[PDB]
Design a protein around this ligand. Structure first.
Ligand SMILES: [Ca+2]
Ligand SMILES: [Ca+2]
Lengths: 130, 130, 130, 130, 130, 130
């Protein structure tokens, strides 16, 4: 229950920024890239904010083995919210997504690591406040 | 705190399936597509599982207005896990992702809906795994 | 007296940086933008620093009216100071400028919003320090 | 506190009027000029009043030096207010502007004369009345 | 013994930034450019960080003379550190470099300003690290 | 605080000379190359002495690992001083450079090894005499 910190690093572009997680070594990078494409209003149409978040953690593979491979694990999350959308709706889709991720962790990454796809899934609704 | 229940609508493909969320009206679709590509072993390289899941909730804009628009809110989580990684490391990246989602909801969608890229981000660690 | 905080939004370029004011909303933007063209020393001519700053506030018109128009309200300030000018004189021109703006607000936007040209003007050279 | 008096010099046109500040000298001009483009009501669109005011102060450089250059120091303010905007918001943008100018004078011309971009800014919303 | 203070003038590029030294007049620039190219991992080869820093001080020649010349003095330190090296080894090379610079200043710039290549060089080891 | 010695080796060219550091093995070279380009006076222009110093230290990488890489660490320092430059100015730029190197060593090679670039830097002025 100890708070996790994420620090700034080089600003790759006007929309792309790179951040270091606490587990980040130079030999094994552990970084979160965040890119926010601001909405450009089309003629007669409201914009749609786009946010893409690439968390990636480098893991040594077979380090004791003579053949060693430095290999990344990536969780990317892109989120397209149109302007004028209810904050409640946005919060709902985020709650559902985080809840499914957590339930998959509790599942021992059954789907992610073993390709098993259950017919019907259940995720406990998450309620968290300040 | 009602368990969010997601059913299997239909099997799109051998790797693609599409589930329906509870709020799924046929007029306003509310779907969760999940695709899992089994890793393909390569000569000298272990496979890498890829699981891509998009959650999509359809919302109206200006329902009372004569000109209304049916637009989707969309979250997407791509997860590339190489074969031979630690379940601990997978849990780490997934907990970090879900925690950042939750903290961004707790942030009143500052980053997503407004485009504020904060210099440093503090996410609560997740002990809700149980 | 409550200080007003101008946050950094995104860095458009090395010259242009957009900041958001506290009144900002994504539907009705309220932003300062600020650019500083550095002095380029010429052959025997010292450079001139040009700082151009554009501040725009987006307000709706006739909200209840079925025909509503979201329009901006802009105040731009361009400031060209040559290198080697005594600082005191730049302090003077800036004080004169802010004082005239303040006196026009005191005058209830006579000049600005009614286009009434006045024959003479009077402003207060208020020296405000820390 | 001594009020500063801006005199009328000559009326260039119905739009443009040049005034002289108290620091004026014919060898080193010190003048405000002020123009108010009135609103032209369009077909269903209310006009926007544009008041552009250019204030220039002419100072010598290196007087004792045999090579001296009489150069101006300019601060221009352009203010575009659409018809029907609440007066309060124009008061707000003008107060914010004058306050930022004042805080830059308080800051000893860091931004203006050294081109140092700051990450955040703070100004005081001082309400000065009659 | 005053702490030498170097400020960030502006962000030139995503990898390039330019700082100003204390003695930085706009007429005689005194800058420290620093560029850090993040290592690019290669197939079978770890990345190698490269950090290049040039310190440049502008000085006049024959100021009293009618024909004077504004010329730069320039130091440049390129530092290529491969990923996975020992911080001890990095400290070794950096201490050796700074010590040779100091000993060359203590040498009254024999090598740099006169071109004397001595057969054997004795540098004090640096215990000022603290 | 034990003195470090640097020995002559083969004279590569009329301007380039190679030296051995004390940590120098034949299997892992540790050498300082020094090259001094003497100033050639142009017609009506004084020369500019150029001095380039490449210190490089070879480090075994993953020696216990089956895959072993012999990899160099390079600190190069080029220094261009024009003829007629004040010795005090030369000494200042060298003091600043060595001070920044030392402060970076004290920084645990934060910039050099991890690409982190602080907004504003401070280096303690170094004063050393015979
Ligand atoms: Ca008249
Ligand atoms: Ca920045």
């Amino acid at each position: 229950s100890k708070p996790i910190a994420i620090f700034k690093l080089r600003e790759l572009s006007s929309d792309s920024t790179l951040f270091t997680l606490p587990g980040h070594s130079v030999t094994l990078p552990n970084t979160l890239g965040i890119v926010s494409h601001l909405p450009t209003p089309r003629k007669g149409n409201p914009g749609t904010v786009k946010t893409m978040r690439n968390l990636r953690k480098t893991i040594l593979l077979g380090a004791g083995t003579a053949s060693e491979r430095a290999v990344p694990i990536v969780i990317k999350t892109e989120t397209s919210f149109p302007v004028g959308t209810t904050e409640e709706d946005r919060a709902e889709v985020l709650k559902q997504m985080a809840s499914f991720l957590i339930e998959e962790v509790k599942n021992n990454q059954e789907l992610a690591y073993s390709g098993y796809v259950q017919d019907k899934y259940f995720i406990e609704d998450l309620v968290i406040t300040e």
